[PDB]
Design an enzyme around this catalytic site. Sequence first.
Site, PDB file in Angstrom:
ATOM      1  N   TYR A 132      32.230  46.301  36.925  1.00 42.08           N
ATOM      2  CA  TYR A 132      31.125  47.235  37.004  1.00 42.08           C
ATOM      3  C   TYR A 132      29.776  46.878  36.371  1.00 42.08           C
ATOM      4  O   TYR A 132      28.754  47.202  36.962  1.00 42.08           O
ATOM      5  CB  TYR A 132      31.620  48.588  36.496  1.00 42.08           C
ATOM      6  CG  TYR A 132      30.601  49.674  36.586  1.00 42.08           C
ATOM      7  CD1 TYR A 132      30.219  50.202  37.820  1.00 42.08           C
ATOM      8  CD2 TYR A 132      29.992  50.163  35.438  1.00 42.08           C
ATOM      9  CE1 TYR A 132      29.253  51.190  37.905  1.00 42.08           C
ATOM     10  CE2 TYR A 132      29.017  51.152  35.505  1.00 42.08           C
ATOM     11  CZ  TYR A 132      28.649  51.663  36.744  1.00 42.08           C
ATOM     12  OH  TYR A 132      27.670  52.630  36.818  1.00 42.08           O
ATOM     13  N   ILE A 148      51.501  36.471  39.179  1.00 40.99           N
ATOM     14  CA  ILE A 148      51.500  37.645  38.323  1.00 40.99           C
ATOM     15  C   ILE A 148      51.620  38.653  39.447  1.00 40.99           C
ATOM     16  O   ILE A 148      50.656  39.010  40.117  1.00 40.99           O
ATOM     17  CB  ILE A 148      50.240  37.767  37.495  1.00 40.99           C
ATOM     18  CG1 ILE A 148      50.292  36.696  36.398  1.00 40.99           C
ATOM     19  CG2 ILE A 148      50.188  39.143  36.838  1.00 40.99           C
ATOM     20  CD1 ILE A 148      49.022  36.502  35.634  1.00 40.99           C
ATOM     21  N   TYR A 174      41.037  36.339  34.698  1.00 42.36           N
ATOM     22  CA  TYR A 174      41.592  37.085  35.829  1.00 42.36           C
ATOM     23  C   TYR A 174      40.410  37.482  36.720  1.00 42.36           C
ATOM     24  O   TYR A 174      39.535  38.238  36.287  1.00 42.36           O
ATOM     25  CB  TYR A 174      42.343  38.304  35.278  1.00 42.36           C
ATOM     26  CG  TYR A 174      42.805  39.352  36.266  1.00 42.36           C
ATOM     27  CD1 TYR A 174      42.837  39.105  37.640  1.00 42.36           C
ATOM     28  CD2 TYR A 174      43.265  40.587  35.809  1.00 42.36           C
ATOM     29  CE1 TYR A 174      43.326  40.066  38.538  1.00 42.36           C
ATOM     30  CE2 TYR A 174      43.759  41.555  36.695  1.00 42.36           C
ATOM     31  CZ  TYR A 174      43.791  41.288  38.058  1.00 42.36           C
ATOM     32  OH  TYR A 174      44.322  42.224  38.935  1.00 42.36           O
ATOM     33  N   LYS A 200      44.199  33.894  36.592  1.00 42.23           N
ATOM     34  CA  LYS A 200      44.938  34.603  37.628  1.00 42.23           C
ATOM     35  C   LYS A 200      44.045  34.883  38.832  1.00 42.23           C
ATOM     36  O   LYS A 200      43.261  35.832  38.827  1.00 42.23           O
ATOM     37  CB  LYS A 200      45.509  35.912  37.079  1.00 42.23           C
ATOM     38  CG  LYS A 200      46.000  36.873  38.150  1.00 42.23           C
ATOM     39  CD  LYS A 200      46.178  38.276  37.594  1.00 42.23           C
ATOM     40  CE  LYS A 200      46.930  39.166  38.569  1.00 42.23           C
ATOM     41  NZ  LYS A 200      47.082  40.554  38.053  1.00 42.23           N
ATOM     42  N   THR A 209      46.096  45.947  35.321  1.00 39.14           N
ATOM     43  CA  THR A 209      45.714  46.880  36.376  1.00 39.14           C
ATOM     44  C   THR A 209      46.907  47.709  36.877  1.00 39.14           C
ATOM     45  O   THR A 209      46.856  48.931  36.963  1.00 39.14           O
ATOM     46  CB  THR A 209      45.093  46.101  37.560  1.00 39.14           C
ATOM     47  OG1 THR A 209      44.273  45.040  37.041  1.00 39.14           O
ATOM     48  CG2 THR A 209      44.222  47.015  38.431  1.00 39.14           C
ATOM     49  N   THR A 210      47.991  47.019  37.194  1.00 41.63           N
ATOM     50  CA  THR A 210      49.203  47.642  37.703  1.00 41.63           C
ATOM     51  C   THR A 210      49.881  48.533  36.658  1.00 41.63           C
ATOM     52  O   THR A 210      50.736  49.363  36.994  1.00 41.63           O
ATOM     53  CB  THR A 210      50.175  46.539  38.188  1.00 41.63           C
ATOM     54  OG1 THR A 210      49.587  45.849  39.304  1.00 41.63           O
ATOM     55  CG2 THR A 210      51.507  47.124  38.603  1.00 41.63           C
ATOM     56  N   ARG A 231      37.651  44.613  42.861  1.00 47.99           N
ATOM     57  CA  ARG A 231      37.686  45.772  41.976  1.00 47.99           C
ATOM     58  C   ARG A 231      36.554  45.739  40.966  1.00 47.99           C
ATOM     59  O   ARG A 231      36.089  46.782  40.523  1.00 47.99           O
ATOM     60  CB  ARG A 231      39.000  45.813  41.198  1.00 47.99           C
ATOM     61  CG  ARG A 231      40.278  45.913  42.004  1.00 47.99           C
ATOM     62  CD  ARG A 231      41.447  45.826  41.046  1.00 47.99           C
ATOM     63  NE  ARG A 231      42.710  46.248  41.645  1.00 47.99           N
ATOM     64  CZ  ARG A 231      43.078  47.516  41.828  1.00 47.99           C
ATOM     65  NH1 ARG A 231      42.276  48.505  41.460  1.00 47.99           N
ATOM     66  NH2 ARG A 231      44.262  47.793  42.365  1.00 47.99           N
TER      67      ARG A 231
HETATM   68  N1  LIG Z   1      32.090  54.179  24.895  1.00 45.95           N
HETATM   69  C1  LIG Z   1      31.296  54.515  26.061  1.00 45.95           C
HETATM   70  C2  LIG Z   1      32.075  54.165  27.324  1.00 45.95           C
HETATM   71  O1  LIG Z   1      33.079  53.193  27.011  1.00 45.95           O
HETATM   72  C3  LIG Z   1      31.122  53.593  28.367  1.00 45.95           C
HETATM   73  C4  LIG Z   1      31.787  53.526  29.736  1.00 45.95           C
HETATM   74  C5  LIG Z   1      32.060  52.081  30.140  1.00 45.95           C
HETATM   75  N2  LIG Z   1      31.840  51.929  31.565  1.00 45.95           N
HETATM   76  C6  LIG Z   1      33.482  51.732  29.814  1.00 45.95           C
HETATM   77  O2  LIG Z   1      34.398  52.316  30.432  1.00 45.95           O
HETATM   78  O3  LIG Z   1      33.696  50.868  28.935  1.00 45.95           O
END
Ligand SMILES: NC[C@H](O)CC[C@H](N)C(=O)O
Lengths: 291, 291
Positions: free
Chosen positions: B107, B203, B133, B161, B44-45, B138
Amino acid sequence: TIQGSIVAIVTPMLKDGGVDWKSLEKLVEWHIEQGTNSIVAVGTTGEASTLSMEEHTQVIKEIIRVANKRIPIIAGTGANSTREAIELTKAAKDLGADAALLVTPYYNKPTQEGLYQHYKAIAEAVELPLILYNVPGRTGVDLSNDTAVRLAEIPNIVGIKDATGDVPRGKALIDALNGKMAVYSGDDETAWELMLLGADGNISVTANIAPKAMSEVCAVAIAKDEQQAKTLNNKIANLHNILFCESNPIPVKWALHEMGLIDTGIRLPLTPLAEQYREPLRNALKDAGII
Amino acid sequence: TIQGSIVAIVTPMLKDGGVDWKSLEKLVEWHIEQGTNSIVAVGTTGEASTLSMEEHTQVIKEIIRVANKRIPIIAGTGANSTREAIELTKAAKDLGADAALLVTPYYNKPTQEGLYQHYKAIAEAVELPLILYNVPGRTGVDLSNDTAVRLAEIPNIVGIKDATGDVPRGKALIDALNGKMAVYSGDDETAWELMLLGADGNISVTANIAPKAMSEVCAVAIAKDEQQAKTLNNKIANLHNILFCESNPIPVKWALHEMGLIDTGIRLPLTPLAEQYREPLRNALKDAGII
Ligand SMILES: NC[C@H](O)CC[C@H](N)C(=O)O
Ligand SMILES: NC[C@H](O)CC[C@H](N)C(=O)O
């Protein structure tokens, strides 16, 4: 401009994890048939994260090829890298997409000014209509209302998919905007209100399984008929709920499986809807008369 | 087995944004001289997010080169796509890294079983020491302590971590593990403490600008010397707050530049430290006696 029920389409897959094209095609005909007003190809629900740039494009293409300019196609082109984002959004434009949907960079937690620079850069590089997407819960960041307003100030930035569920917040935004850019709900639970409060539509997950119902709820909610919005939404409320008993789109993809419309495919890190919510989902689908 | 001050190294950039191989080598050579025990390449850093797979590999490559096997090099191979994570982890193993740090998928918010499967899949695909980790803030996900303990069973899943900052929770993990895998702090502010409680090291972000100091702190807390850990932490305990006045690595990359070590390079969506935090940091640095 783009209004109504805009389904964030899943990317059907095979038991091995390969995209299921025959099943993707059938789903697009079925939405157009059913009354869906538009489609997001490869959005969160479309497993954008687990699809390669080539699959991203193939799908964007196929959805556009089967749509055959019958209803507008919004291409999922977000990335947590500005550069990367420019590459998918141009690819999208080249593929003939009507618009692009770019979630806010997730995980690298950009500043609000970074969120401003990120979109402006993308907006000035590819001449395509762009719709921002704020869903802090997933991204780690939160595109503030004020930031959204600064952006509506940019040619090419045409809307913002709002998934907060915070209605009065959503309302503040719509008002502050005074029609400079569209707002769509990214929360099925409160979409009918948001549209009743002047939102241009719902970028719906529920619309994957109940496209007619939803476009009907959208139509009357954008039409400003409070009681019908409530009355028809209520028929499908239980669905907005049970479709997130696990992370989207784990359940909806199982919902569509029970419907017999897709096979159980889904790319790790995601997993098939846990055995535990399978009867609970199966009934909710029967209560709504979808099977 | 790898213990002490482990620096999540920044990835220096030139004004244009391309990597600063000249400075990167200097920073690697200077961390070894100062006392840093290990380096995390492209985490990340280090902006793993905005570096292509080509650059991702080049950096692990250069850091592995310059260190000359004097200290172990951990490679940031994390991705929110399992198949992708496996590719990034394989390249590291091939480049000759010592272990790999993989942030939980961000995400797409997998389930805990999804998390279990994801890491289980990488461990069986790549023959390499791996370090989980967790940083809910985030990613939008939280690797439960019980999933971590389940995952410690897997042969080459050798550490985690913890960036939660949740000390009680942290010790409870350290306890449950009973040595099955190493625990590191992913939080400078409370690291000194986590280490006094059993943790194998930090870390660290602060180690980017105060390598010797953190190195000192790590050792004494690993020696379980309570007062010393505390007394030394104090020297820098205020730097643990200033380096996050904006989203890491935003502040840290500035500091390094203020220390005349790297140029202003940083990739969008991230940005140079906001002017309103520049003097504050400088004086926090001056106080610490770094500049
Ligand atoms: N190859 C398409 C793209 O990776 C899709 C976005 C996904 N959220 C990522 O950053 O992995
Ligand atoms: N290595 C290239 C890749 O797109 C990196 C982006 C990824 N989303 C990350 O957080 O590391």
